[PDB]
PDB file of C-alpha atoms in Angstrom:
ATOM      1  CA  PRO A   1     -21.540  -9.401   4.862  1.00 26.72           C
ATOM      2  CA  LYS A   2     -18.582  -7.086   5.504  1.00 24.16           C
ATOM      3  CA  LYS A   3     -15.931  -9.805   5.575  1.00 21.95           C
ATOM      4  CA  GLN A   4     -17.186 -11.071   2.212  1.00 24.70           C
ATOM      5  CA  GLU A   5     -17.315  -7.596   0.630  1.00 24.29           C
ATOM      6  CA  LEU A   6     -13.811  -6.925   1.958  1.00 26.21           C
ATOM      7  CA  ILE A   7     -12.515 -10.124   0.332  1.00 25.62           C
ATOM      8  CA  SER A   8     -14.364  -9.203  -2.855  1.00 28.75           C
ATOM      9  CA  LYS A   9     -13.108  -5.615  -2.968  1.00 29.07           C
ATOM     10  CA  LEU A  10      -9.476  -6.646  -2.527  1.00 27.27           C
ATOM     11  CA  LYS A  11      -9.837  -9.143  -5.387  1.00 30.96           C
ATOM     12  CA  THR A  12     -11.536  -6.684  -7.727  1.00 31.77           C
ATOM     13  CA  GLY A  13      -9.079  -3.920  -6.820  1.00 32.69           C
ATOM     14  CA  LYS A  14      -6.162  -6.197  -7.698  1.00 34.70           C
ATOM     15  CA  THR A  15      -7.792  -7.114 -11.021  1.00 34.35           C
ATOM     16  CA  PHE A  16      -8.314  -3.458 -11.956  1.00 31.43           C
ATOM     17  CA  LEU A  17      -4.637  -2.843 -11.111  1.00 32.07           C
ATOM     18  CA  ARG A  18      -3.502  -5.754 -13.278  1.00 34.06           C
ATOM     19  CA  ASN A  19      -5.629  -4.377 -16.105  1.00 32.70           C
ATOM     20  CA  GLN A  20      -4.149  -0.868 -15.896  1.00 30.66           C
ATOM     21  CA  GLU A  21      -7.311   0.686 -14.461  1.00 29.85           C
ATOM     22  CA  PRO A  22      -5.899   2.373 -11.344  1.00 28.90           C
ATOM     23  CA  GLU A  23      -8.756   4.827 -10.761  1.00 29.87           C
ATOM     24  CA  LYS A  24     -11.225   1.936 -10.628  1.00 33.99           C
ATOM     25  CA  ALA A  25      -8.731   0.028  -8.449  1.00 36.27           C
ATOM     26  CA  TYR A  26      -8.500   2.954  -6.039  1.00 36.79           C
ATOM     27  CA  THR A  27     -12.281   2.928  -5.552  1.00 36.40           C
ATOM     28  CA  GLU A  28     -12.251  -0.767  -4.670  1.00 37.33           C
ATOM     29  CA  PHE A  29      -9.282  -0.540  -2.313  1.00 39.36           C
ATOM     30  CA  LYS A  30     -10.752   2.533  -0.581  1.00 37.34           C
ATOM     31  CA  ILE A  31     -13.882   0.508   0.238  1.00 37.21           C
ATOM     32  CA  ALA A  32     -11.681  -2.364   1.396  1.00 37.46           C
ATOM     33  CA  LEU A  33      -9.806   0.046   3.681  1.00 39.71           C
ATOM     34  CA  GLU A  34     -13.012   1.379   5.238  1.00 42.74           C
ATOM     35  CA  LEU A  35     -14.401  -2.145   5.751  1.00 43.24           C
ATOM     36  CA  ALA A  36     -11.138  -3.466   7.191  1.00 43.05           C
ATOM     37  CA  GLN A  37     -11.078  -0.568   9.640  1.00 43.04           C
ATOM     38  CA  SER A  38     -14.714  -1.204  10.598  1.00 45.81           C
ATOM     39  CA  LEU A  39     -13.916  -4.884  11.153  1.00 46.50           C
ATOM     40  CA  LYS A  40     -10.748  -4.074  13.117  1.00 45.60           C
ATOM     41  CA  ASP A  41      -8.747  -6.321  10.792  1.00 46.53           C
ATOM     42  CA  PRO A  42      -5.317  -4.678  10.511  1.00 47.91           C
ATOM     43  CA  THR A  43      -3.943  -7.479   8.329  1.00 52.28           C
ATOM     44  CA  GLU A  44      -6.553  -6.786   5.659  1.00 48.67           C
ATOM     45  CA  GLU A  45      -6.186  -3.056   6.282  1.00 51.23           C
ATOM     46  CA  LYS A  46      -2.546  -3.311   5.224  1.00 53.36           C
ATOM     47  CA  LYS A  47      -3.548  -5.066   1.988  1.00 55.10           C
ATOM     48  CA  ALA A  48      -6.013  -2.274   1.206  1.00 55.11           C
ATOM     49  CA  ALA A  49      -3.427   0.404   2.010  1.00 55.49           C
ATOM     50  CA  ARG A  50      -0.869  -1.256  -0.271  1.00 57.51           C
ATOM     51  CA  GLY A  51      -3.469  -1.409  -3.042  1.00 58.51           C
ATOM     52  CA  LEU A  52      -4.235   2.288  -2.588  1.00 58.67           C
ATOM     53  CA  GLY A  53      -0.527   3.142  -2.677  1.00 61.64           C
ATOM     54  CA  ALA A  54       0.022   1.097  -5.835  1.00 61.06           C
ATOM     55  CA  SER A  55      -3.062   2.619  -7.482  1.00 59.75           C
ATOM     56  CA  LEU A  56      -1.810   6.111  -6.695  1.00 61.87           C
ATOM     57  CA  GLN A  57       1.671   5.314  -8.039  1.00 63.17           C
ATOM     58  CA  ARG A  58       0.101   4.234 -11.345  1.00 65.96           C
ATOM     59  CA  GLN A  59      -1.662   7.608 -11.454  1.00 64.79           C
ATOM     60  CA  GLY A  60       1.575   9.509 -10.819  1.00 67.10           C
ATOM     61  CA  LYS A  61       0.257  10.645  -7.432  1.00 68.56           C
ATOM     62  CA  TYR A  62       3.421   9.891  -5.494  1.00 67.56           C
ATOM     63  CA  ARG A  63       2.836  11.981  -2.355  1.00 68.93           C
ATOM     64  CA  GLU A  64      -0.588  10.476  -1.783  1.00 68.47           C
ATOM     65  CA  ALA A  65       0.910   7.045  -2.500  1.00 70.68           C
ATOM     66  CA  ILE A  66       3.465   7.538   0.280  1.00 71.47           C
ATOM     67  CA  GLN A  67       0.621   8.283   2.708  1.00 76.07           C
ATOM     68  CA  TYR A  68      -0.873   4.841   2.066  1.00 75.42           C
ATOM     69  CA  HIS A  69       2.328   2.808   1.902  1.00 73.09           C
ATOM     70  CA  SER A  70       3.279   4.524   5.169  1.00 70.18           C
ATOM     71  CA  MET A  71       0.111   3.094   6.722  1.00 68.65           C
ATOM     72  CA  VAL A  72       1.449  -0.392   6.029  1.00 68.28           C
ATOM     73  CA  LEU A  73       4.503   0.516   8.113  1.00 70.17           C
ATOM     74  CA  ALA A  74       2.494   2.228  10.845  1.00 69.78           C
ATOM     75  CA  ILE A  75      -0.028  -0.601  11.264  1.00 73.12           C
ATOM     76  CA  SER A  76       2.818  -3.127  11.321  1.00 71.93           C
ATOM     77  CA  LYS A  77       4.491  -1.323  14.219  1.00 70.81           C
ATOM     78  CA  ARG A  78       1.256  -0.968  16.179  1.00 68.22           C
ATOM     79  CA  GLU A  79       0.362  -4.639  15.715  1.00 69.29           C
ATOM     80  CA  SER A  80       3.906  -6.012  15.893  1.00 67.14           C
ATOM     81  CA  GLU A  81       3.052  -7.897  12.713  1.00 65.12           C
ATOM     82  CA  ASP A  82       5.481  -7.592   9.832  1.00 63.54           C
ATOM     83  CA  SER A  83       3.578  -8.678   6.695  1.00 64.64           C
ATOM     84  CA  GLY A  84       4.286  -6.368   3.757  1.00 64.04           C
ATOM     85  CA  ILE A  85       6.793  -3.969   5.227  1.00 60.57           C
ATOM     86  CA  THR A  86       9.609  -4.946   2.849  1.00 61.04           C
ATOM     87  CA  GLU A  87       7.458  -4.164  -0.172  1.00 62.11           C
ATOM     88  CA  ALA A  88       6.319  -0.906   1.430  1.00 65.22           C
ATOM     89  CA  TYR A  89       9.904   0.303   1.924  1.00 63.85           C
ATOM     90  CA  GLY A  90      10.690  -0.317  -1.731  1.00 64.94           C
ATOM     91  CA  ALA A  91       7.489   1.368  -2.914  1.00 66.36           C
ATOM     92  CA  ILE A  92       8.116   4.429  -0.736  1.00 70.25           C
ATOM     93  CA  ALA A  93      11.684   4.637  -2.045  1.00 70.96           C
ATOM     94  CA  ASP A  94      10.318   4.515  -5.604  1.00 72.49           C
ATOM     95  CA  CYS A  95       7.835   7.288  -4.805  1.00 74.49           C
ATOM     96  CA  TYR A  96      10.510   9.558  -3.334  1.00 72.87           C
ATOM     97  CA  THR A  97      12.672   8.896  -6.400  1.00 75.80           C
ATOM     98  CA  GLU A  98       9.871  10.100  -8.685  1.00 73.37           C
ATOM     99  CA  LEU A  99       9.497  13.177  -6.466  1.00 73.76           C
ATOM    100  CA  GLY A 100      13.217  13.903  -6.757  1.00 72.84           C
ATOM    101  CA  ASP A 101      13.754  13.472  -3.026  1.00 74.31           C
ATOM    102  CA  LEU A 102      17.002  11.547  -3.294  1.00 74.29           C
ATOM    103  CA  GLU A 103      17.772  11.812   0.429  1.00 71.55           C
ATOM    104  CA  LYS A 104      14.557  10.128   1.570  1.00 73.56           C
ATOM    105  CA  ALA A 105      14.620   7.727  -1.390  1.00 75.00           C
ATOM    106  CA  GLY A 106      18.070   6.587  -0.319  1.00 74.08           C
ATOM    107  CA  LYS A 107      17.072   5.961   3.299  1.00 74.85           C
ATOM    108  CA  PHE A 108      14.081   3.821   2.353  1.00 74.57           C
ATOM    109  CA  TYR A 109      16.002   2.058  -0.413  1.00 75.05           C
ATOM    110  CA  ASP A 110      18.825   1.127   1.971  1.00 74.48           C
ATOM    111  CA  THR A 111      16.345  -0.391   4.427  1.00 73.05           C
ATOM    112  CA  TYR A 112      14.545  -2.187   1.594  1.00 75.44           C
ATOM    113  CA  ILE A 113      17.759  -3.845   0.387  1.00 77.78           C
ATOM    114  CA  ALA A 114      18.952  -4.580   3.941  1.00 78.30           C
ATOM    115  CA  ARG A 115      15.658  -6.317   4.590  1.00 80.30           C
ATOM    116  CA  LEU A 116      15.746  -8.279   1.291  1.00 80.98           C
ATOM    117  CA  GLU A 117      19.202  -9.524   2.301  1.00 85.02           C
ATOM    118  CA  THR A 118      17.558 -11.248   5.291  1.00 82.42           C
ATOM    119  CA  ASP A 119      14.918 -13.033   3.147  1.00 80.23           C
TER     120      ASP A 119
END
């Protein structure tokens, strides 16, 4: 049941995002996050966290967005599993830019580009 709902919620969250409905997307991704945590599936947890971060960015909620993109980074370190960290660096940089935090934006941006150069 939970694995299927998790799959479903990630899909529907992404669709809401694509259709410029970020509040509805947030709801879906928040369920996905809870289910992924219950299932102890950090890979899916990172997808939910990214979705939350993106949904919050669309809403202009940049500080909250950083909280969720930062989870992608934190889970990746704990699991030694690198999926999604490049995108997270760039998203966090973008958030700090909107917040006017040029110092932090620059640090994350530099890492983002450095990582893209190794793609």
